[PDB]
Amino acid sequence: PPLPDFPLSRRGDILPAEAERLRAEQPVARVRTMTGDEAWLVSSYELAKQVLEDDRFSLKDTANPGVPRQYALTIPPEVVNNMGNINSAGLRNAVMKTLSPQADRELGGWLEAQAHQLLDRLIEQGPPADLRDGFTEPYSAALHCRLLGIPTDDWRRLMSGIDVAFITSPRTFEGSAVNWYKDLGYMVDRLNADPEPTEGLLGRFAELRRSPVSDELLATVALSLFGAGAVSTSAFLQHAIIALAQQPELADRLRAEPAVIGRAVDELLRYNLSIGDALPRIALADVRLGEVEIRAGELVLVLIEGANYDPAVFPHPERIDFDRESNPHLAFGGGQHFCPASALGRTHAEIALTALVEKLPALRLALPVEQLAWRPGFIKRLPERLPVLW
Amino acid sequence: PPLPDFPLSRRGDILPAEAERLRAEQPVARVRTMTGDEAWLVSSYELAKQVLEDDRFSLKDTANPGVPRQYALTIPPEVVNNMGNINSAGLRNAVMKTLSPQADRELGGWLEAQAHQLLDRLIEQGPPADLRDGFTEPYSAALHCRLLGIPTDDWRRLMSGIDVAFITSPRTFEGSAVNWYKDLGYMVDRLNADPEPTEGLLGRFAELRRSPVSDELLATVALSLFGAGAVSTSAFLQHAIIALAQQPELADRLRAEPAVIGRAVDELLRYNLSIGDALPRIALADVRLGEVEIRAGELVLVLIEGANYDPAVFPHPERIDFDRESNPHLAFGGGQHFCPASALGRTHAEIALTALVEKLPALRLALPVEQLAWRPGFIKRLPERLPVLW
Ligand code: HEM
Ligand code: HEM
Ligand SMILES: O=C1N[C@@H](Cc2c[nH]c3ccccc23)C(=O)N[C@H]1Cc1c[nH]c2ccccc12
Ligand SMILES: O=C1N[C@@H](Cc2c[nH]c3ccccc23)C(=O)N[C@H]1Cc1c[nH]c2ccccc12
Numbered sequence: 094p095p096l097p098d099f100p101l102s103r104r105g106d107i108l109p110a111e112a113e114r115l116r117a118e119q120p121v122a123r124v125r126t127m128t129g130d131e132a133w134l135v136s137s138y139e140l141a142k143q144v145l146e147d148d149r150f151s152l153k154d155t156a157n158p159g160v161p162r163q164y165a166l167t168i169p170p171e172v173v174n175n176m177g178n179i180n181s182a183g184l185r186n187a188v189m190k191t192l193s194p195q196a197d198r199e200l201g202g203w204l205e206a207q208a209h210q211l212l213d214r215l216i217e218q219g220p221p222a223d224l225r226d227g228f229t230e231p232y233s234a235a236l237h238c239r240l241l242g243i244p245t246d247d248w249r250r251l252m253s254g255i256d257v258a259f260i261t262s263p264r265t266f267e268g269s270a271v272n273w274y275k276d277l278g279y280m281v282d283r284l285n286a287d288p289e290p291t292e293g294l295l296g297r298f299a300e301l302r303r304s305p306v307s308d309e310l311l312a313t314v315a316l317s318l319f320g321a322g323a324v325s326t327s328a329f330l331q332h333a334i335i336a337l338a339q340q341p342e343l344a345d346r347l348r349a350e351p352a353v354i355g356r357a358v359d360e361l362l363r364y365n366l367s368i369g370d371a372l373p374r375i376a377l378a379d380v381r382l383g384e385v386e387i388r389a390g391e392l393v394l395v396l397i398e399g400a401n402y403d404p405a406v407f408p409h410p411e412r413i414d415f416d417r418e419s420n421p422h423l424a425f426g427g428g429q430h431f432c433p434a435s436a437l438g439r440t441h442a443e444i445a446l447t448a449l450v451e452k453l454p455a456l457r458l459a460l461p462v463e464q465l466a467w468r469p470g471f472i473k474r475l476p477e478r479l480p481v482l483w
Numbered sequence: 484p485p486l487p488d489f490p491l492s493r494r495g496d497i498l499p500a501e502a503e504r505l506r507a508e509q510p511v512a513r514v515r516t517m518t519g520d521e522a523w524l525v526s527s528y529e530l531a532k533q534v535l536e537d538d539r540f541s542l543k544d545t546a547n548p549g550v551p552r553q554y555a556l557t558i559p560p561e562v563v564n565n566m567g568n569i570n571s572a573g574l575r576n577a578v579m580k581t582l583s584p585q586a587d588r589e590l591g592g593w594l595e596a597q598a599h600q601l602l603d604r605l606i607e608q609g610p611p612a613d614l615r616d617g618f619t620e621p622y623s624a625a626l627h628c629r630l631l632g633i634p635t636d637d638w639r640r641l642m643s644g645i646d647v648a649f650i651t652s653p654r655t656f657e658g659s660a661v662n663w664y665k666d667l668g669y670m671v672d673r674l675n676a677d678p679e680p681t682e683g684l685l686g687r688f689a690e691l692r693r694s695p696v697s698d699e700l701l702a703t704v705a706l707s708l709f710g711a712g713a714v715s716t717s718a719f720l721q722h723a724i725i726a727l728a729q730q731p732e733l734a735d736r737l738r739a740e741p742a743v744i745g746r747a748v749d750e751l752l753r754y755n756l757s758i759g760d761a762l763p764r765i766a767l768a769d770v771r772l773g774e775v776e777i778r779a780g781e782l783v784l785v786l787i788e789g790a791n792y793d794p795a796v797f798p799h800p801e802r803i804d805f806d807r808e809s810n811p812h813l814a815f816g817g818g819q820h821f822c823p824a825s826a827l828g829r830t831h832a833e834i835a836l837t838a839l840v841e842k843l844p845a846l847r848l849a850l851p852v853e854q855l856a857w858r859p860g861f862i863k864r865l866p867e868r869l870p871v872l873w
């Protein structure tokens with residue numbers, strides 16, 4: 094027989110029909126990834142949660158030489174185990190402090206001013222505008238520059254590094270390594286500036302070195318937090334914007350009841366299709382999952398949108414609903430590798446969307462949603478441009 | 484039977500197989516355009532040249548209400564007849580003077596400095612780089628700002644207007660009009676600045692008004708020359724860059740024999756697939772073309788890549804050849820509507836490519852060519868990003 098192909102459709106404004114078929118017919122399914130390797134794709138909520146919470150399915154080992162892959166590695170293999178290294182070298186406190194919105198008491202107001210500065214610029218020029226290049230991208234880059242303690246002068250160059258680093262390729266491509274060492278050197282340069290960095294992660298790193306871990310490791314943590322955070326928050330915010338543009342009753346709700354923003358972002362997180370690949374794990378032992386015997390060394394892929402649209406857990410999953418009794422979604426993952434920046438991720442989006450619905454109350458797409466250009470060959474699903482009117 | 488669909492593949496680094504099949508099997512072919520309308524697609528060189536040179540096939544009338552269309556009009560219908568209006572209002576001299584590289588004796592050196600400034604910035608940051616956002620786009624925008632006599636401060640906003648204005652849509656979309664009047668107002672504002680514009684097209688327009696045509700018409704000419712010129716030169720240069728990256732022997736030729744740049748750009752023009760739609764005409768009378776009787780009022784579409792790859796006129800058309808005995812290509816069209824800026828278009832590309840092969844002698848793509856993202860739904864074919872190493 095012929096295996097289902099993975100990944101699924103690049104279109105991000107509706108659940109791929111194949112994700113619903115996989116969950117209903119084979120919630121654990123043998124698929125052929127873009128590399129030609131085979132994998133177990135897990136698409137029901139119950140089994141996805143199980144995999145994430147069972148440490149016999151290893152994220153760290155997905156980077157090992159010889160294992161099957163959903164796409165070529167574009168970063169050093171130790172970086173897939175970023176949190177595992179952050180913990181072992183005594184970096185966790187500096188990292189966890191940086192990721193905590195409660196440790197930066199100005200963050201809230203500063204993010205709000207950043208959002209409004211960007212939106213005011215767009216309003217001055219008049220519609221239409223591209224809310225990716227004109228809003229999400231600079232806003233997400235500005236946040237992560239603040240997190241690291243670096244200026245925003247080179248934010249376009251840094252976001253362009255993300256455009257290469259998060260490519261999904263069937264085979265390794267020259268360029269991934271060149272791109273990695275390019276921005277690793279950038280981070281080293283910032284850490285080792287004569288007027289040594291204060292503020293943010295690089296400021297904490299500078300202090301940590303003078304106390305009684307190498308420069309390459311410090312910059313690696315800085316670079317991978319910048320790239321992973323900026324690309325994930327920018328892509329999620331783009332998906333959230335599309336929802337509020339296509340469903341203006343949701344923006345009316347946010348304007349009428351500003352305090353629902355927390356629940357609203359929690360539901361947009363469940364709904365959002367920005368994860369354009371699956372969460373990967375290598376089985377370290379034989380494990381039975383659902384009706385399938387998974388053998389040690391095989392690749393397991395957790396399909397987050399399959400789980401988050403599972404009607405056994407989320408009634409009317411295809412309908413955005415800010416008033417669900419229960420919303421135990423997997424948008425941030427689960428288990429050991431649950432997103433350590435989930436609070437910052439929520440803050441980023443809540444503040445941006447609050448500013449957006451206030452400043453652009455007639456927000457709508459400037460063209461039918463089916464004519465958005467969805468980026469191919471990337472870890473995230475995202476529109477190449479997000480043209481809107483207001 | 485089922486008609487062939489138009490447009491053809493968005494992939495721009497190889498001729499679409501369908502373009503070769505159409506030319507060989509039905510060089511005048513009934514096709515279904517993206518609007519659902521029907522058209523005559525002309526794909527052989529002999530018949531394409533015939534249409535372009537026969538004024539019974541009208542460009543001006545392609546904008547008329549009720550006529551069949553290859554895609555929705557995104558601009559006022561009078562703007563499709565831009566040159567026809569420029570001529571009638573006594574604007575031709577100011578326009579033709581602006582479009583002449585010989586009327587701006589600093590242009591050559593200035594373009595060369597612009598190219599090298601952009602490339603030096605990329606070299607300082609190190610590879611990889613996106614040569615669209617980092618080179619073609621700002622270089623093409625800088626040229627057209629110079630042409631008009633406006634500063635480059637808002638070049639990103641202006642190129643984003645191009646991203647909307649040149650969309651191909653099956654039906655009219657809100658946004659096209661909003662976008663047009665947005666940048667029309669921008670051009671009015673520049674023309675009507677208190678420190679009145681000197682220099683360029685707006686400087687000539689300001690003088691022309693005080694002499695013994697409205698503000699809207701003047702800004703319309705400015706806006707449509709900016710958009711058409713910037714989008715066409717940027718897209719062509721991107722296609723030329725891909726060729727020199729994929730065929731480094733061509734860059735060796737340019738470095739060894741700098742004076743061949745004129746012939747080299749002439750061949751890259753024949754080869755280039757940046758025109759992603761066809762040149763449209765409405766038949767004003769019944770005309771027999773090839774084996775087909777075309778009736779008055781029908782839509783005729785000239786497929787430039789079919790003509791420019793016609794082996795009856797260009798031997799080994801699939802192979803770039805800087806030493807062809809004869810190269811009567813249709814990259815700039817033909818007949819009455821032949822590109823009035825062809826000399827500027829050649830200068831733009833010749834200077835950029837000369838700088839490129841000097842500054843990035845090891846230029847190559849940073850990923851297999853098949854993994855470039857080609858933009859959908861646009862008049863031009865272009866890679867969304869052009870990542871390169873050197
Ligand atoms: C809307 C925003 C975000 C979403 C949807 C998101 C989602 C996720 C998901 C699904 C995982 C689990 C991956 C797996 O299990 O294989 C994860 C892990 C991770 N994310 Fe987030 N992320 C977001 C923002 C951020 C931010 C702001 C940062 C950093 C500044 C960040 C840093 C990380 C790191 C370091 C990990 C790995 C954790 C580990 O391996 O233990 N993320 N994220
Ligand atoms: C590499 C660059 C360029 C290419 C490949 C190109 C190609 C063409 C083609 C194929 C046509 C004929 C359209 C038809 O017959 O329907 C045309 C027309 C035109 N182009 Fe160019 N173009 C380029 C650059 C420019 C520049 C730099 C400008 C302006 C600054 C410009 C302005 C125009 C105008 C106004 C027309 C309409 C002429 C008429 O209707 O009589 N183009 N171009
Ligand atoms: O910290 C990490 N932990 C895991 C899981 C993970 C966290 N955030 C992600 C966002 C997308 C994909 C995977 C992850 C990982 O795989 N790598 C990095 C992040 C990263 C930095 N640059 C990259 C280029 C390519 C892929 C990942 C990264
Ligand atoms: O001057 C023009 N003459 C014709 C032919 C033409 C010249 N250069 C082109 C480049 C692409 C497509 C058509 C043309 C036309 O159609 N319009 C305009 C150009 C233009 C300004 N903005 C636009 C948005 C959309 C489409 C065209 C324009």
Ligand SMILES: Nc1nc2[nH]cnc2c(=O)[nH]1
Pocket residue numbers: 325367368369370371372373472473
């Ligand atoms: N595999 C994967 N891991 C992530 N961690 C955070 N975001 C993502 C994503 O899109 N894919």
Ligand SMILES: Nc1nc2[nH]cnc2c(=O)[nH]1
Pocket residue numbers: 715757758759760761762763862863
């Ligand atoms: N139809 C059409 N006309 C043009 N004139 C200049 N460039 C183009 C193009 O790509 N398409």
